[PDB]
Amino acid sequence: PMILGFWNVRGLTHPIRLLLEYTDSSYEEKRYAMGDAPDYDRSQWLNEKFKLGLDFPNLPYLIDGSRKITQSNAIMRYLARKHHLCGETEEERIRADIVENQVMDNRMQLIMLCYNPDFEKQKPEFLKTIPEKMKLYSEFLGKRPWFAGDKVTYVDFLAYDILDQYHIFEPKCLDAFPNLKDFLARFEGLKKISAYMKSSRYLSTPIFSKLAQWSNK
Amino acid sequence: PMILGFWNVRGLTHPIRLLLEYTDSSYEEKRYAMGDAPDYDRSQWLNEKFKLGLDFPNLPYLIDGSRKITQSNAIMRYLARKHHLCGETEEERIRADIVENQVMDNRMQLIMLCYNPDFEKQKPEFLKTIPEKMKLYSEFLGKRPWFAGDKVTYVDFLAYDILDQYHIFEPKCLDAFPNLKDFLARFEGLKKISAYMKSSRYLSTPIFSKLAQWSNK
Numbered sequence A, B: 001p002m003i004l005g006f007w008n009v010r011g012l013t014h015p016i017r018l019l020l021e022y023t024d025s026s027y028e029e030k031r032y033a034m035g036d037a038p039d040y041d042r043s044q045w046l047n048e049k050f051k052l053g054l055d056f057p058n059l060p061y062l063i064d065g066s067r068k069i070t071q072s073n074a075i076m077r078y079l080a081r082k083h084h085l086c087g088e089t090e091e092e093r094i095r096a097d098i099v100e101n102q103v104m105d106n107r108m109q110l111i112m113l114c115y116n117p118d119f120e121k122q123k124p125e126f127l128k129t130i131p132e133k134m135k136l137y138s139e140f141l142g143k144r145p146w147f148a149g150d151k152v153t154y155v156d157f158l159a160y161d162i163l164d165q166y167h168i169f170e171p172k173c174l175d176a177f178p179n180l181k182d183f184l185a186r187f188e189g190l191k192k193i194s195a196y197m198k199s200s201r202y203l204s205t206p207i208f209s210k211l212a213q214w215s216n217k
Ligand SMILES: N[C@@H](CCC(=O)N[C@@H](CS[C@@H]1c2ccccc2-c2ccccc2[C@H]1O)C(=O)NCC(=O)O)C(=O)O
Pocket: A007, A009, A011, A012, A049, A057, A058, A059, A060, A070, A071, A072, A073, A107, A108, A111, A207, A208, A209, B101, B105
């Protein structure tokens, strides 16, 4: 089958695992473990980093026969093309493009905070910024059922993940945004998703590696 | 015409300024200035950030008729689709997907180094990771004229920019990789490119804002 490699955390790989399940892909996973502080040993990965034939070795990676991919967005697009889960008109394409990239930004902002030695003192400032990020997603989605238009596309998988993470981080963050709360429930409502969430494979937390200041164990 | 908005620095917009020229696009730019220390006023932008009707306001932005786009990668792909500068086959799409995302990683690595107060401190070590970064681009490219394959595609504008930047940072970083040096000369040799580099509109430095520790002026 296809091999997905990543750390044994949700990290930035949730969308992929979700999309592999949604599409009924036949895949196996390799979940590398990181050791504990203070050294946070990475040897399980490092032992094979340069042995897998990857052009730009990194995690996550996807091996699909002779096809070897790295970079999460490139893996997401590869599986989207295979399964017809890309936008179909220019307008959906542009919406898809923007959201892909915007998710990445919002993901990096969370990371910078959670790996900041000053997490606890930085936290208050970060919180204040949340309602503005969510408003932008709320107004972008509006009354559409999904981010790109009328049909699920790979970008709903990225959007779900990041909205779900901010929601774990600040549970009351979606209170003001009905259509967001509704998008979460709709997504989780998809038959394949629903069934995966009850599976042995489901990995929602920790979100971050042991190095982080939040959701690290 | 189209409007490109961004700071008056090369930043991460080089690839879009290059592509507008290559495609002979009719564009004007709004180059925002940041005031100087100690408050580095961003008011010129901030006064209109939410008045442009962008979905997720940011810089760069492109306005193209009724289309309004943010996210540099999204602007790049929009222009690529508009001018047929995308990969044509599955192998070329995958190669483009990976490179697009890898360039962003290598970009963030540089930015992250350049915005650290401990810059001078960190240079040395950063300087040793370079050989390995270049080697990967070099092997990936191999004997091909362009990164996706047989034809110039938008990712070549991305690859050009980051190899250019690394080369400004470490003038000798490419002596070991002649195919990369050849790629820089072939890109710069493109007709519309050459003319742009001698024009008043060309902005190859500074790279970073006044905030930065290198290429900040
Ligand atoms: N742009 C690329 C990003 C590739 C990359 O940096 N990968 C990390 C793991 S991803 C990492 C992470 C590691 C552990 C736990 C969490 C994270 C995480 C979470 C959210 C967002 C970013 C992160 C990141 O901090 C990794 O360990 N790489 C193998 C290595 O360096 O040898 C992508 O989109 O695919």
